[PDB]
Amino acid sequence: VGPSVLPDLREQVEQIIAEARRQGASACEVAVSLEQGLSTSVRQGEVETVEFNRDQGFGITLYAGQRKGSASTSATGEAAIRETVAAALAIARHTSEDECAGLADAALMARELPELDLYHPWSLSPEQAVERALACEAAAFAADKRVTKADGTTLNTHQGCRVYGNSHGFIGGYASTRHSLSCVMIAEGEGQMQRDYWYDVNRRGEALASAESIGRRAAERAASRLGARPVQTAEVPVLFAPEIAVGLFGHFLGAISGGSLYRKSSFLEGALGQRLFPEWLSIDERPHLVGALGSASFDSDGLATYAKPFVENGELVSYVLGTYSGRKLGLPSTANAGGVHNLFVSHGDEDQAALIRRMERGLLVTELMGQGVNLVTGDYSRGAAGYWVENGEIQFPVQEVTIAANLRDLFRRIVAVGKDIERRGNLHTGSVLVESMMVAGR
Amino acid sequence: VGPSVLPDLREQVEQIIAEARRQGASACEVAVSLEQGLSTSVRQGEVETVEFNRDQGFGITLYAGQRKGSASTSATGEAAIRETVAAALAIARHTSEDECAGLADAALMARELPELDLYHPWSLSPEQAVERALACEAAAFAADKRVTKADGTTLNTHQGCRVYGNSHGFIGGYASTRHSLSCVMIAEGEGQMQRDYWYDVNRRGEALASAESIGRRAAERAASRLGARPVQTAEVPVLFAPEIAVGLFGHFLGAISGGSLYRKSSFLEGALGQRLFPEWLSIDERPHLVGALGSASFDSDGLATYAKPFVENGELVSYVLGTYSGRKLGLPSTANAGGVHNLFVSHGDEDQAALIRRMERGLLVTELMGQGVNLVTGDYSRGAAGYWVENGEIQFPVQEVTIAANLRDLFRRIVAVGKDIERRGNLHTGSVLVESMMVAG
């Protein structure tokens, strides 16, 4: 599973497309995936599993005019291809016609594909996987006498190849890697027991934060929570840690995606051209970053991806749409069939410490809990944990509180975005200072 | 994919074991899985996907003395077996010795295997699949003017075959089938949007509750929630709806499983032989039920499964253990490598309506939220929703409250178990009336 195999997979995709044709299909879309890697788990100094995985499959979506049919299988080979295609068509021929259905026009298929350098094999023997996973836990325990237990420490290293093709003649494919190391620790103190973790993800294993650093960090976090208590119900400013900030903007994205929009299940429906954020705030996508964890050179329709803004000086200038979204809404695709890639929120020059100082007083949120977000109405209420701030400092840990606001207002009330930017996924935000929110606790 | 295909999978298992031997592993364990079915989704009267799946794979766990390794693939053939076994061994040979590691003794492999009749293909064209999924959503909307939106209604019908083997020479395998229809609805009222759902599951497609009945129910449930409000903080009795009662006993199971126990991460850690429940309460396992959703004739070590109690007259008479658990704890296996199969909590003759009455005043819980359960200590706190009861009737819907207690005390405080028994999974409980809990709002 490397670039070296990509050619076999192209050939496989060609055969699937050809078979669909032989069987009478109007058009079709095919995806093939190979993946393999090694996954190591440790706990309380014990190795629990060390496992090697190799997974292959393909899925096809077919058309019989305006009728649609899908099928997938992990089998390979001629009979399999014949069997899977025949199934997609049994469905296509017995389901109904969709006006919006069918591939993008052929002129729209990516003409060329940048090299995104996503493939960095990690030479990692299971002996070194176990060595590191254990060095991580041990650094946790070694960091504070009060960290007395662990949930898993998991080290994951994987390689994959994906190829996509359609009846329009498009065929595109890339190989990638992803390595991660997560650590989950339990600490006891002040009449209580508290839990936290840390992790890192990188396409190049070598760029992962040291196993030690990840462990120390999961431990400090666990320990800092000891002695958490509620606070007095009050409307105060709230500071979201970068990794919780990410989820917020996730709700933004969901709300501006075609699916939500045309299902009339989005608070942001119709918001194109509106000020949803502060004048200084921009949100923009950069799909071609070399080595990035969210890079992609084409979307799930096979349109070329391109750099673009979604929010510009506070203003929503674009929804996130694929071909079928666009047709549903009477708009063009934004070459985002399958979502965004490498999203960025613009930020100032202040770090979390600076932002805490600026907040003066309020709630720093480092964890949220529950399903309290309604995308249809923007209504938001979630359990939360973190630290209370006063006189520009962290006074003490907080738990058993809930936070409330409408997202619509929340986004308007963003006071700053920090330069303490998260790098472990597809959405780079720093910490987010919100002017005020309803904090409730008893 | 059914019984006709088993012998091919046996043969495949044999080959893998042989190939393990060829590469010099001391012993091994192999599992092969084939699965296929149809999955239909509908939403607001639209069809969103109709898809046919077919998935095959195998996994092997190898030993090199007291050293252990595992690998899996979904590929097939002489080269896939060679490459996958080679990999499990590369790991075995480069990881450390575990004194407790290795298979169960050969004497213990299941000598025979009852016919559990878990295989009931559903002749369901995608045309019919879609007809039904839609008829379910339509019944929901038709049930109450206030049910204005939907999340998915999903219909799944699948078939599988599993075969497992040992280097001890044990080989065993069964075909099964599993069909479900779930419906998720949204109501609007009273300043509110409320979400709820209903579903059914059965190995026989025809035994599923009608698509209409499932829809009506998801809608009634969504609608009943409109106007939910908090209640005043108080210590009071709490009645768990059967489907939430399942999750409770799940914490109990987790707590008496080998892993929790030897990791010293269980509040029930020395509990064998103690009263944890009312004298009248018993919990027992019945793995051989014909056609049940949880039936199994052998565990993940290949020991024969058998009917047995875990709680007898309120007393914990058994943990849930596999061979590796047993060794860790210095105890025999309870033929429960991979968990329990078809568990039952004993109950009285009262239904949910009867238990509401008996409770007189308190909180009926029909949903929980938040990962608020500490199995290490038993501490429990969770977001909850349902209805308030007074004068033995449901007064109004409740939301934005939490419930708290230690499970240790909670289980001691069980007043009764309803006969409204839950059938859609591995755990058959009725509604659970708890004497008192801390309700906060």
The per-residue DSSP string of B1-20 comes to --STTHHHHHHHHHHHHHHH
Amino acid at position B17, single letter: I
Number of Cβ within a 10 Å radius of residue B94: 17
Q: Do A74 and B87 touch (CB under 8 A)?
A: no
What CA–CA distance (Å, rounded) separates B411 from B434?
Answer: 8
What CA–CA distance (Å, rounded) separates A345 from B141?
Answer: 41
Count of CA atoms in the C-beta half-sphere (13 A) of A75 = 21
What CA–CA distance (Å, rounded) separates B124 from B134?
Answer: 15
What CA–CA distance (Å, rounded) separates B115 from B299?
Answer: 15
**In the block, which residue shows the tokens 């990509």?**
A6
The helix/strand/coil state of A155 is strand
Amino acid at position B219, single letter: A
Count of CA atoms in the C-beta half-sphere (13 A) of A345 = 30
Nearest to B149 by CA among B86, B91, B213, B222: B222
Structure tokens at A291: 């080595």
**Pairing label, strands A414-417, B171-189:** unpaired
Q: H or E stretch including B359?
A: helix B352-359
Distance of CA A341 to the CA centre of its chain: 9
**In the block, which residue shows the tokens 């058994």?**
B318
- The alpha carbon of residue B205 is apart from the nearest alpha carbon of chain A, in Å, by 20
Q: Which residues of A368-389 are buried (b: 16+ CB within 10 A; e: fewer)?
A: bbbebbbbbbbbbbbbbbbbbb
Query: CA separation (Å) from B79 to A70, A192, B76, B264?
Result: 30, 54, 8, 42
Which residues in chain A precede a discontinuity of more than 2.5 Å between C and N? none
**Pairing label, strands B308-312, B315-316:** antiparallel
For chain A, give me the number of helices (H) and strands (E)?
Answer: 9, 17
What CA–CA distance (Å, rounded) separates A430 from A435?
Answer: 16
Question: Which positions ≥6 away from A4 have C-beta within 8 Å?
Answer: none
Long-range contacts of B397-400 (CB under 8 A, 24+ apart): B397/B224, B397/B225, B397/B226, B397/B227, B397/B228, B397/B229, B398/B228, B398/B229, B398/B230, B398/B231, B398/B363, B398/B441, B399/B225, B399/B228, B399/B229, B399/B230, B400/B228, B400/B229, B400/B230, B400/B441
Question: Which positions ≥6 away from A290 have C-beta within 8 Å?
Answer: A116, A117
**In the block, which residue shows the tokens 């709490």?**
B238
* DSSP label of B105: P
Dihedral angle, C-alpha A368, A374, A379, A385, nearest 10 °:
-10
B74 chain-A contacts, CB cut-off 8 A: 54-57, 74
Nearest to B103 by CA among B170, B161, B58: B170
What CA–CA distance (Å, rounded) separates B154 from B182?
Answer: 5
CB B47 within 8 A of CB B38: no
The helix/strand/coil state of B280 is coil
Q: Helix, strand, coil shares of chain A as percentages rounded to 5? A: 25, 40, 35
Query: CA separation (Å) from B348 to B277, B308, B310, B430?
Result: 15, 20, 19, 9
**In the block, which residue shows the tokens 């190939």?**
B19
Number of Cβ within a 10 Å radius of residue B243: 17
Angle between helices A126-143 and A211-224 (to 10 degrees): 30
Q: Order of strands, edge to edge, in the sheet holding A283-285?
A: A315-316, A308-312, A283-285, A343-345, A427-428
Domains of chain A: 1-228 (3.30.2290.10), 229-442 (no CATH)
- The alpha carbon of residue B83 is apart from the nearest alpha carbon of chain A, in Å, by 10
Tell me the torsion sign for CA atoms B139, B140, B143, B148.
negative
Q: Do B69 and A50 touch (CB under 8 A)?
A: yes
Question: Residue A62 class from Cβ within 10 Å (0-12 exposed, 13-18 middle, 19+ buried)?
Answer: buried
**Pairing label, strands A379-390, A393-406:** antiparallel
B12 phi/psi in degrees, rounded to 5: -60, -45
B69 chain-A contacts, CB cut-off 8 A: 50, 126
Query: CA separation (Å) from A278 to A243, A274, A343?
Result: 21, 11, 18
Beta strands in A203-314 (DSSP E): 234-240, 283-285, 308-312
Beta strands in B86-170 (DSSP E): 147-166
CB A277 within 8 A of CB A311: yes
Question: Which positions ≥6 away from B342 have C-beta within 8 Å?
Answer: B285, B286, B287, B289, B292, B293, B294, B295, B426, B428
CB B226 within 8 A of CB B187: yes
B65 phi/psi in degrees, rounded to 5: 75, -125
Number of Cβ within a 10 Å radius of residue A45: 11
CB A118 within 8 A of CB A174: yes
What CA–CA distance (Å, rounded) separates B303 from B297?
Answer: 9
What CA–CA distance (Å, rounded) separates B250 from A436?
Answer: 40
- The alpha carbon of residue B349 is apart from the nearest alpha carbon of chain A, in Å, by 36
Structure tokens at B9: 């999978």
**In the block, which residue shows the tokens 């934004």?**
A334
Q: Do A374 and B193 touch (CB under 8 A)?
A: yes
Q: Which residues pair with A64 in a beta bridge?
A: A67
- The alpha carbon of residue A53 is apart from the nearest alpha carbon of chain B, in Å, by 5
Q: Do B371 and A376 touch (CB under 8 A)?
A: no
Number of Cβ within a 10 Å radius of residue B61: 23
Q: Which residue of B has its CA nearest to A378?
A: B193
Output the DSSP codes for B30-88: EEEEEEEEEEEEEETTEEEEEEEEEEEEEEEEEEETTEEEEEEES--SHHHHHHHHHHH
B184 chain-A contacts, CB cut-off 8 A: none
Q: Do A370 and B383 touch (CB under 8 A)?
A: yes
Query: CA separation (Å) from B269 to B97, B274, B316?
Result: 26, 11, 11
The helix/strand/coil state of A198 is strand
Q: Which residue of B has its CA nearest to A441?
A: B441
Question: Which positions ≥6 away from A171 have C-beta within 8 Å?
Answer: A10, A13, A14, A163, A164, A165
What CA–CA distance (Å, rounded) separates B147 from B189?
Answer: 9
CB B19 within 8 A of CB B123: no
Q: Do B75 and A56 touch (CB under 8 A)?
A: yes
What CA–CA distance (Å, rounded) separates B133 from B153?
Answer: 6
Count of CA atoms in the C-beta half-sphere (13 A) of B435 = 10
Q: Which residue of B has its CA nearest to A81?
A: B54
- The alpha carbon of residue A350 is apart from the nearest alpha carbon of chain B, in Å, by 33
Q: Which residue of A has its CA nearest to B264?
A: A149
